[PDB]
Amino acid sequence: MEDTQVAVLTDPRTGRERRRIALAGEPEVTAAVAEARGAGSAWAALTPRLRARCLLRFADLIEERSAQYVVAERSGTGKPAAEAAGEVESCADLLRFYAGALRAGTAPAAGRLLPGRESWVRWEPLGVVAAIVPWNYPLMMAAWRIGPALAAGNTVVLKPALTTPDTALLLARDAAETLGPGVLVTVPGDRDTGRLLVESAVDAVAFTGSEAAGRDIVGRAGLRRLSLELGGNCPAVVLPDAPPDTYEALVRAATYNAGQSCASPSRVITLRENYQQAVEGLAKAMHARRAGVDFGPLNNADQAARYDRIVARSGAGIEHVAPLAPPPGEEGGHWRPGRILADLPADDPAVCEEVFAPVLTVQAADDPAEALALANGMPQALAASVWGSRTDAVLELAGELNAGEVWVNCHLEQTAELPHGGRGTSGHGTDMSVLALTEYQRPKTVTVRL
Amino acid sequence: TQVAVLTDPRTGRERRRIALAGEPEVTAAVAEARGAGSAWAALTPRLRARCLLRFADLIEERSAQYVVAERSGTGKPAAEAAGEVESCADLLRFYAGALRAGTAPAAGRLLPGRESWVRWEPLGVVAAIVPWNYPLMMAAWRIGPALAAGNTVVLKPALTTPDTALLLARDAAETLGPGVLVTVPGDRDTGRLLVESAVDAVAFTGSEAAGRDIVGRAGLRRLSLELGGNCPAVVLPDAPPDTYEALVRAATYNAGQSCASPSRVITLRENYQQAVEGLAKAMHARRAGVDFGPLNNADQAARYDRIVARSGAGIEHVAPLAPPPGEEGGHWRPGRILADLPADDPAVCEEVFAPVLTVQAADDPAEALALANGMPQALAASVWGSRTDAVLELAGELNAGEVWVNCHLEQTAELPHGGRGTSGHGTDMSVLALTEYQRPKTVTVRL
Numbered sequence: 001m002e003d004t005q006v007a008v009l010t011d012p013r014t015g016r017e018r019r020r021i022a023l024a025g026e027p028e029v030t031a032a033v034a035e036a037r038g039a040g041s042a043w044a045a046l047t048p049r050l051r052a053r054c055l056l057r058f059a060d061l062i063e064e065r066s067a068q069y070v071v072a073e074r075s076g077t078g079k080p081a082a083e084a085a086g087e088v089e090s091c092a093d094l095l096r097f098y099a100g101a102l103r104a105g106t107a108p109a110a111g112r113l114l115p116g117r118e119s120w121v122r123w124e125p126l127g128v129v130a131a132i133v134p135w136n137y138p139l140m141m142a143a144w145r146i147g148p149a150l151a152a153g154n155t156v157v158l159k160p161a162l163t164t165p166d167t168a169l170l171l172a173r174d175a176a177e178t179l180g181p182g183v184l185v186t187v188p189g190d191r192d193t194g195r196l197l198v199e200s201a202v203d204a205v206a207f208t209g210s211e212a213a214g215r216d217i218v219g220r221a222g223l224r225r226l227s228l229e230l231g232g233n234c235p236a237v238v239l240p241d242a243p244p245d246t247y248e249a250l251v252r253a254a255t256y257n258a259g260q261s262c263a264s265p266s267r268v269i270t271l272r273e274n275y276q277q278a279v280e281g282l283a284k285a286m287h288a289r290r291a292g293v294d295f296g297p298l299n300n301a302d303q304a305a306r307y308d309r310i311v312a313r314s315g316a317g318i319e320h321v322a323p324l325a326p327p328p329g330e331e332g333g334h335w336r337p338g339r340i341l342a343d344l345p346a347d348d349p350a351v352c353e354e355v356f357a358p359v360l361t362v363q364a365a366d367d368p369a370e371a372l373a374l375a376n377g378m379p380q381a382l383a384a385s386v387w388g389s390r391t392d393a394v395l396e397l398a399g400e401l402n403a404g405e406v407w408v409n410c411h412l413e414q415t416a417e418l419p420h421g422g423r424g425t426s427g428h429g430t431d432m433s434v435l436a437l438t439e440y441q442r443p444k445t446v447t448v449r450l
Numbered sequence: 451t452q453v454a455v456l457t458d459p460r461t462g463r464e465r466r467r468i469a470l471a472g473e474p475e476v477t478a479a480v481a482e483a484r485g486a487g488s489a490w491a492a493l494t495p496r497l498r499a500r501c502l503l504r505f506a507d508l509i510e511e512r513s514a515q516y517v518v519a520e521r522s523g524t525g526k527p528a529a530e531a532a533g534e535v536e537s538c539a540d541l542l543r544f545y546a547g548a549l550r551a552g553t554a555p556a557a558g559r560l561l562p563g564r565e566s567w568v569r570w571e572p573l574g575v576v577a578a579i580v581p582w583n584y585p586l587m588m589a590a591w592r593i594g595p596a597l598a599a600g601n602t603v604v605l606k607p608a609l610t611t612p613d614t615a616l617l618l619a620r621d622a623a624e625t626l627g628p629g630v631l632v633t634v635p636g637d638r639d640t641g642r643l644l645v646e647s648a649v650d651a652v653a654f655t656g657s658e659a660a661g662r663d664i665v666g667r668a669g670l671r672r673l674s675l676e677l678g679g680n681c682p683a684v685v686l687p688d689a690p691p692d693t694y695e696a697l698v699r700a701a702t703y704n705a706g707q708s709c710a711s712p713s714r715v716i717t718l719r720e721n722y723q724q725a726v727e728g729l730a731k732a733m734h735a736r737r738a739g740v741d742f743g744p745l746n747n748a749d750q751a752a753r754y755d756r757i758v759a760r761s762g763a764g765i766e767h768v769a770p771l772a773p774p775p776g777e778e779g780g781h782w783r784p785g786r787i788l789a790d791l792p793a794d795d796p797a798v799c800e801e802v803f804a805p806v807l808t809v810q811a812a813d814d815p816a817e818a819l820a821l822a823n824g825m826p827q828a829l830a831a832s833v834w835g836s837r838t839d840a841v842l843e844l845a846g847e848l849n850a851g852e853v854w855v856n857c858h859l860e861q862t863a864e865l866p867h868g869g870r871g872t873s874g875h876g877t878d879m880s881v882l883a884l885t886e887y888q889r890p891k892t893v894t895v896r897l
């Protein structure tokens with residue numbers, strides 16, 4: 001029976017049609033998983049040398065076509081040119097990192113561990129990995145999952161978010177040229193496509209997205225290996241001797257990708273002495289950041305309405321709204337301005353919810369110990385920053401914060417070598433660094449009687 | 451509070467009446483472990499390792515009581531229980547040492563103008579839920595790395611075998627500090643209440659059905675699963691002379707109640723009959739009640755009966771049953787060799803969890819590998835043969851976390867164990883186990 005599900009995608013900067021795309025249903029998901037399964041034996045049988053070379057060519061091909069990736073990434077996100085260009089560079093770098101890391105791995109030392117036996121330990125891939133990724137960093141979130149998965153010798157079915165299939169489709173095209181047909185397969189679709197993929201004949205699921213989706217996936221993934229990266233609600237603890245550029249730096253991080261980052265600063269926590277300085281300093285810095293000029297739109301109409309709802313429900317006694325300046329002809333885009341909210345209770349909706357927009361709340365604590373309690377007082381625990389001059393104060397807080405990343409006098413700065421990953425309700429995945437490879441491979445002990 | 455009335459599996463007679471924990475007791479146990487978490491996590495690695503070394507030595511100092519306790523609800527022979535007490539202490543010493551010797555991604559100037567480093571941090575309170583087949587060792591496998599990583603632990607032993615878990619909690623209190631390890635006896639609903647409690651992670655060892663339930667019940671808690679095996683032993687025609695004796699020894703260890711016990715013997719056509727007869731001769735010398743212990747409980751014995759009755763095996767060799775006088779009411783089942791059976795036979799596809807071996811023939815090593823890898827479960831395997839290229843090529847191809855060559859069921863604290871497929875994806879033993887119980891933190895400092 002002839003049947004095609006269709007999405008008419010729109011540019012978030014303008015609201016106009018940009019792309020009509022067919023969505024994958026059960027037949028396309030089943031076929032994609034079978035294609036990756038069929039490519040698995042030849043891909044896994046490559047030596048590390050040959051596998052690394054393929055991934056290096058993959059990264060160079062992305063780089064060679066970087067202008068095309070930049071346009072594709074911006075079409076569905078509204079990202080500024082400079083942010084998209086940086087993320088294409090970071091994508092290729094991450095692939096190069098794992099290309100090199102897959103040859104440099106270690107295992108428990110081999111030898112005579114049992115009397116009269118020679119033993120060693122080898123690492124082996126899981127098989128087919130499903131990677132399901134959101135719209136906020138389509139290319140980078142794809143790279144975080146497929147990089148280590150492919151490098152560990154798995155094949156991959158990649159399911160991008162409904163509004164941002166574009167770079168995932170280019171990745172599949174360029175992987176076919178450099179890794180081989182079927183090694184990386186992309187299936188565009190909405191949430192239902194993702195659910196079908198989780199129930200398919202894949203060996204593992206690598207998910208990045210909302211907590212509600214994460215909780216649904218846990219149940220329906222069964223005994224498949226599961227890696228979750230969920231929301232953050234990240235604190236920034238600002239001490240009275242914080243450096244002069246603290247407010248500019250925090251506002252720069254909060255308006256990067258229009259504040260649509262898991263690890264963006266959200267909950268600014270000061271002491272009593274610097275509370276009003278921080279509110280005014282953040283308000284002045286944010287006011288210089290104009291939506292439509294200095295950062296992009298929110299991804300879609302649901303995000304903009306959600307922003308509106310949380311702002312309306314907040315009991316903030318102080319509210320500073322930055323300018324809204326959509327370019328000519330872009331009034332139909334999902335533009336929302338920067339906001340600073342202050343004078344609000346510890347359980348305020350703007351504090352407790354992940355706003356996912358350039359909104360900063362400001363709370364005051366009596367002393368560093370209460371600031372730490374506020375910072376660690378949320379169920380999510382992903383990233384954090386500390387701002388201050390005194391080594392003992394900031395490094396002690398850095399050890400105490402419940403987060404996979406703690407920045408001191410900076411925020412939202414990442415590199416392929418250093419891990420990222422949550423606690424609490426943020427999921428327990430590890431992205432970046434050599435530590436990410438372990439999620440996609442399993443050890444085998446071989447013990448030989450002499 | 452409900453009271454469980456436990457019986458001795460060697461006799462069927464009452465042996466212990468012990469409280470079965472419900473929600474109030476589970477909730478209080480988790481709060482006790484949570485209250486101990488801050489001081490335990492604050493110990494330096496030097497002090498934490500010294501605590502765990504004293505824990506291991508206290509267990510060995512009290513090994514006679516651990517042996518009696520372990521045997522009481524299992525029926526294990528004395529020599530097997532004594533060896534498992536030694537392995538328990540050794541594993542604790544291994545993780546005492548490993549916790550000081552860890553590494554992390556190298557620190558330094560990874561970003562311009564930034565100094566970065568990576569530290570490891572505990573999850574918090576870990577729930578350890580373990581089965582009755584190796585009560586002490588499976589407790590050790592979970593609590594060892596969890597405690598060494600700075601977590602406190604709530605340990606939920608199987609209903610029929612709380613005995614050594616209670617001793618561990620007493621001896622942990624004396625060496626690690628009160629509340630660092632808390633033991634909660636109970637049944638599967640005690641375990642479900644623990645999964646739903648305010649623990650940060652669940653480390654589970656047991657049946658596939660329970661694992662599937664726990665996945666849905668555990669929510670966003672970090673989860674580690676060690677589930678069933680159905681382990682093949684590929685026996686080539688040039689396998690060494692002691693092959694059948696060694697396979698039978700591994701299959702009757704702990705009355706075959708091992709996740710990694712050999713189950714599916716797979717030969718070629720030229721050595722098929724030799725294997726059936728050699729295994730039957732070796733198994734016939736192992737008499738249930740003298741040379742190995744009972745099955746754990748009446749459910750296990752009935753499960754044995756159902757699988758054997760359902761099998762379409764054309765060949766069946768039954769070893770003798772010889773329970774001592776006074777032990778006629780225990781859950782005794784004999785060793786068995788089954789052969790001449792289809793590839794989807796119940797005895798082949800199910801984990802019998804008793805001293806039963808099936809024997810199947812393949813045309814060549816390629817088809818032997820297909821059979822060995824043709825099950826949903828994928829935990830451990832062995833290969834028996836003399837030629838280096840043949841056995842080592844098979845060892846690479848088998849889907850298993852452990853492959854033994856010309857041996858079976860031999861483990862040590864340094865070397866990992868862990869499943870694929872429907873066997874779960876946890877890692878036990880080796881330094882690799884520690885990662886399940888800790889999380890990295892990148893600290894990046896602006897210069």
Ligand SMILES: NC(=O)c1ccc[n+]([C@@H]2O[C@H](COP(=O)([O-])OP(=O)(O)OC[C@H]3O[C@@H](n4cnc5c(N)ncnc54)[C@H](O)[C@@H]3O)[C@@H](O)[C@H]2O)c1
Binds near residue numbers: 195208214263
């Ligand atoms: N922890 C991290 O590293 C990280 C990184 C980026 C984003 N995030 C989080 O992701 C969230 C973004 O929200 P969103 O609305 O884009 O997330 P979402 O969960 O709605 O969508 C994410 C992806 O999952 C798919 N999906 C949704 N429900 C599914 C289901 N039941 N089964 C299978 N697939 C399903 C979607 O189609 C999409 O591809 C934020 O909470 C953010 O913090 C976390």
Ligand SMILES: NC(=O)c1ccc[n+]([C@@H]2O[C@H](COP(=O)([O-])OP(=O)(O)OC[C@H]3O[C@@H](n4cnc5c(N)ncnc54)[C@H](O)[C@@H]3O)[C@@H](O)[C@H]2O)c1
Binds near residue numbers: 580639664677709801
């Ligand atoms: N390393 C491994 O992979 C490994 C090691 C030993 C045993 N095993 C497997 O363990 C199995 C033993 O079977 P069994 O019947 O004793 O196991 P089981 O799953 O019935 O019980 C195991 C433990 O889990 C508890 N439990 C049961 N259901 C639960 C639930 N829904 N939620 C929480 N806790 C629950 C029980 O009370 C007990 O403490 C075998 O299949 C064997 O292969 C695996």
